Ligand binder design. Structure first.
Ligand SMILES: NC(=O)C1=CN([C@@H]2O[C@H](COP(=O)(O)OP(=O)(O)OC[C@H]3O[C@@H](n4cnc5c(N)ncnc54)[C@H](OP(=O)(O)O)[C@@H]3O)[C@@H](O)[C@H]2O)C=CC1
Ligand SMILES: NC(=O)C1=CN([C@@H]2O[C@H](COP(=O)(O)OP(=O)(O)OC[C@H]3O[C@@H](n4cnc5c(N)ncnc54)[C@H](OP(=O)(O)O)[C@@H]3O)[C@@H](O)[C@H]2O)C=CC1
Ligand SMILES: NC(=O)C1=CN([C@@H]2O[C@H](COP(=O)(O)OP(=O)(O)OC[C@H]3O[C@@H](n4cnc5c(N)ncnc54)[C@H](OP(=O)(O)O)[C@@H]3O)[C@@H](O)[C@H]2O)C=CC1
Ligand SMILES: NC(=O)C1=CN([C@@H]2O[C@H](COP(=O)(O)OP(=O)(O)OC[C@H]3O[C@@H](n4cnc5c(N)ncnc54)[C@H](OP(=O)(O)O)[C@@H]3O)[C@@H](O)[C@H]2O)C=CC1
Lengths: 334, 334, 334, 334
């Protein structure tokens, strides 16, 4: 029903496409990227991390043909020239990573789209939404340039919410042991971050993250109470958040796990999950949820300090949330 | 001067051997391992993580010959038949990973040695020492079977001591993002630990660690105040400790780093180092200290919760501490 | 239909089980391994390379339950005590890697089995079969202990057959760039083979292979004509054969390629596959065929020397051939 | 003595700098790159593959200071604006990877340099040289735009020569199992080569190479007799050439290796090396020669077809040859 257009057919752009495939509410009608149709068709079909796409993919001229439907392919470096209006694209997924500033993303609205979903933290956006945490604050009349936050914020917020409501967070530190991404280097080379300039697959690479702070965007009561960092490691996909927090209430591992398990089966079902199996990162490659609690890792010291570990497929979970967001927006009245 | 014998010529045994070459006080005279002299010579000469041994290594009979010195090579699976006393071996480094209980390690003293140093946490040891933290509690009469603790406790204890003495630690939790060891599997295979049963170079593997509890063995004032877990990752060597602690005094990042820098330059010189460079794990490969503070990572929320990150070459740093301990015991009288 | 028992639930045993799931003719009813049921079930369900087993798996007592069926789990290191017959096991899949000598594998026959299939090269086996090559020489009276050869031989044989019948192989060399296996080491440690004693995920490790010579067992005409080596690399699965050969006839890439494609859709369908896509190893992870010609790599020099490259998932292609052999044998008579 | 300028301070540029340090005849006086002095200084001091630079390095304003010597750092994207003459640079090392066509490479000559060395196969260059093979064909009044060929060609050529002179190469095929380079992608991304568009550390990626045919540039006699391909694998540095050749003479493995060993100690000493140790890739990391025969791998079928395997540090051995070429050209008169 809702016609979607994707700007930047990269790791997130292609996985949003895959995610959209199984959703009948949304419909991707066009993609824009710097690469050509044939190169794009090849990368959509064969994925080193998620396997082959089970859908027939072809190229008809300058367009992709997926399961008989023609997807238009544009090669506009400048968003302003996209003409989303002519093709009837309602919602645009901004996933180039170049246009997270409102002044850039809005160029899509001026080009013909009705809503823009920036797939990353943004600046001067109308609203940052984390599904399961605050999609209710979205106003169809007021918000048009929306941010879906980072994969890490989507992983942390859902459970920081439950921890906050049930016991109360005084302050907390977090660390995400995260898989490497296309922002890193294969072998030592210039990068604006001297840590990310180092061979990605060869080391544990500490780097900064704003995901901790961003939680305040969706959970205002936590402003100034959380901070953290990231450690990029030699894995191609899937990451894990490690949150150590000072609680207001005295608690037990049993109480904490039970609270998390409850949310995962109730209110946050589909966003937050709960596991008691001794699994590893590879086991989570492909999970569509935003945050899966690794229940076995939960610990408490002095009844007030806690450690909660949650898994997340940074490409898949996130891409599913983008599609869910799109579908939610469409339903609230486009 | 003091003759040493190494039991278990593996990753730690060979690196202890490499460390001893640069120490005039200790003298390695014999090694015991299940492998044959030729295999052991090859593995000592060429190392995938540390490169070529800068010394002449050859085989004479079924004995090793290093830089002209003949090293007796034994092959007794039962420590009771090593006859250390006959060849004048006073100190034995127990690094097979199988004789960590005082009862077993003690078989070396029966074979004639005067002291045994277990290169790992032990059960029932006379004392557990972390050089720079509690070596002064070593008693020549009462302590024969000593544990050098884990590579992780050796990294944590030195700065936890500083944080404690300077600001007071109320409680803290740690996570070590650690390189894989010979205790894991290349491909999925039977293992006591179902996390460690999974392909080491393919996932982030949360695993348990007693390393945070063990700090209380060397710093009793911290008994019951710390806890933590581990995460094994696809790197062959070098690990990092991530410590989050609730302090008593309100501090700033500058105060925390200044204290750390001062100790690295003072009392803990040689054991605790300090760095303000944006480096990655591969850069600490070969580091001989026990803990190198990543100053650029220090963080603080609410003036009371601090985050400190420290690097450690789990093989080289620990192996150097073993040699330092052997040298310190010898100087106390054997 | 035909009852099968698996000896050694390792990578090949668990993948033979998985492949067994979609074949109506055979039925796995018992497994024997060094590990416990809970461990065996965990590793059967979660696989770091192939993913979650899409089947309900659980432990009932000392037994496994997989989609309602209860699989008998035993722990006998001595195959003579397995009592295959009491439980009706017709065919035994010997995949421990320890009993490759006929005298050893024959213990299962002493135990009540009727046929044994060694999942690797053997010594004094009654016959070595490569499905699609010489399975027609199996004689239910004459052969009881059969070898399914190596993953490499199953990859090389099918296309070396075609090439030989078509143009005449005068002589040729092969090199298999193979993923690492459980036979290698994570970090430097003792090994019969000093190349394989080195950290598996850190290097390109040259090693021997009898795969080229073993082709003579299934194709006598090629006796004394082929030879080769292996190079183990940092991937956990999927390998490729690189064959360079001198033909008797003068050929063109087109001809060589047409010959191979023709066979893939003809006689060798399901065993030999043909590809004109520019794919990479991870794309073949999960392929059930034995050999997939990488058509774009075929080269010819002087119209007489050819180069052919074929991919193979060493775990899946092989485990499927094992299941096929079991099914073929049974159809021939037990 | 001779003043050198490096255009493109990447993997090859920094390693050419390092090698240059060890040569008294050459003096690197300037570097041109897209990154700033601080970034460049950091990347030169810390290498993920080669370790810390054994030198005193600092940034004096906008220049590098290495052991007292100041290195002018420029940020020109267009070589025409480089002004090499202004600073006295006689030889320019073109290592950006973007100016291999004579039209671009010569812009250096126009900007004032006297000679240009292209660190890769070139187009319309005056001469392609492989040290130890045809450096003597260098004509100082004619040859101003020189290509040092590729790392692969530098590995193959030296031994292709010896085999030819001694037994006569009728024809041969080569495969290079090569480490990934900065030309590949960390994760699936657009690339003109759909093979190299795939996650570099996750697969065995077959790709093309012109290194076999390029041997004809330096050993004209072998024009039309060789061809081959490459396989990029998940290792950061060090590669191996696998050559299968049809010889004119009847040979034995001993005959083959004896020829190679002699050459390594004779004419090609310093370029070609010989090894009878069972080593692996990491062992060759840091090797300065261009090719090292893995003697244990030499194989022969029918006394006419040989297989020779040679290791090569693609970054170090090559950079040394670049510096050797610069020192040689200069000796002839600039
Ligand atoms: N990967 C992950 O785990 C997650 C990433 N994100 C965010 O998603 C965004 C994309 O990241 P990711 O998909 O990983 O990165 P990629 O590099 O894989 O993808 C970005 C795609 O956009 C293309 N592109 C760049 N500029 C243009 C342009 N001007 N017009 C059209 N297309 C263009 C790129 O091509 P090219 O660069 O080759 O020119 C590339 O194909 C980033 O902002 C990232 O922070 C959010 C959650 C998770
Ligand atoms: N790896 C690291 O970073 C650290 C490890 N340690 C500890 O040090 C110990 C060794 O670890 P690591 O070196 O990594 O392991 P390795 O497996 O590399 O070394 C252990 C060695 O002991 C040999 N061995 C086993 N049993 C005997 C025996 N009964 N008699 C003689 N030799 C024997 C083993 O041979 P084989 O395998 O053939 O049985 C192997 O060669 C463990 O306690 C570990 O926890 C401490 C700090 C760091
Ligand atoms: N992996 C591949 O690519 C291929 C391997 N093969 C062959 O299959 C055999 C196994 O290969 P792979 O699966 O990779 O090896 P694994 O190590 O994964 O599997 C071997 C299994 O046998 C078990 N085992 C060993 N001894 C006994 C015993 N005495 N009694 C009961 N169970 C035992 C092992 O348990 P434990 O470790 O606890 O002792 C292990 O789980 C080898 O011969 C190999 O060459 C053939 C084709 C392909
Ligand atoms: N790596 C190896 O094993 C070998 C490589 N070579 C060849 O050497 C060349 C360099 O390769 P390599 O060092 O591997 O690759 P790198 O990408 O690491 O090096 C290229 C360097 O040149 C810089 N650069 C790019 N464009 C310009 C420009 N317009 N002006 C100034 N500087 C520029 C790059 O900056 P930036 O990162 O911002 O684009 C980078 O620092 C290639 O031709 C390659 O084929 C030859 C033998 C071996």
């Amino acid at each position: 029903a809702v016609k979607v257009g994707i700007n930047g057919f990269g790791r997130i752009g292609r996985n949003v496409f895959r995610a959209a495939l199984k959703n009948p509410d949304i419909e991707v009608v066009a993609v824009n990227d710097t690469g050509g149709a044939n190169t794009l068709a090849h990368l959509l079909k064969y994925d080193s991390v998620h396997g082959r796409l089970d859908a027939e993919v072809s190229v008809n001229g300058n367009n992709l043909v997926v399961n008989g439907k023609e997807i238009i392919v544009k090669a506009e470096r400048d968003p302003e020239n996209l003409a989303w209006g002519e093709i009837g694209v309602d919602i645009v997924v901004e996933s180039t990573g170049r246009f997270t500033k409102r002044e850039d993303a809005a160029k899509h609205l001026e080009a013909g789209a009705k809503k823009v979903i920036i797939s990353a933290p943004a600046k001067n956006e109308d609203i940052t939404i984390v599904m399961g945490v605050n999609q209710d604050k979205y106003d169809p009349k007021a918000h048009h340039v929306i941010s879906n936050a980072s994969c890490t914020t989507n992983c942390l917020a859902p459970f920081a919410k439950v921890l906050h409501e049930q016991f109360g967070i005084v302050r907390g530190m977090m660390t995400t042991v995260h898989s490497y991404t296309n922002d890193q280097r294969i072998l030592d080379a210039s990068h604006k971050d001297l840590r990310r300039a180092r061979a990605a697959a060869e080391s544990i690479i500490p780097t900064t993250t704003g995901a901790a702070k961003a939680v305040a965007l969706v959970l205002p009561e936590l402003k100034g109470k959380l901070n953290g960092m990231a450690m990029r490691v030699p894995t191609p996909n899937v990451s894990v958040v490690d949150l150590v927090a000072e609680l207001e209430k005295e608690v037990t591992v049993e109480e904490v796990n039970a609270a998390l398990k409850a949310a995962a089966e109730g209110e946050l079902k589909g966003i937050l999950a709960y596991s008691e199996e001794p699994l590893v990162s590879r086991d989570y490659n492909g999970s569509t949820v935003s945050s899966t609690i690794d229940a076995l890792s939960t610990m408490v010291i002095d009844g007030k300090m806690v450690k909660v570990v949650s898994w997340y497929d940074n490409e898949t979970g996130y891409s599913h949330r983008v599609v869910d967001l799109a579908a939610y927006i469409a339903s609230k009245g486009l």
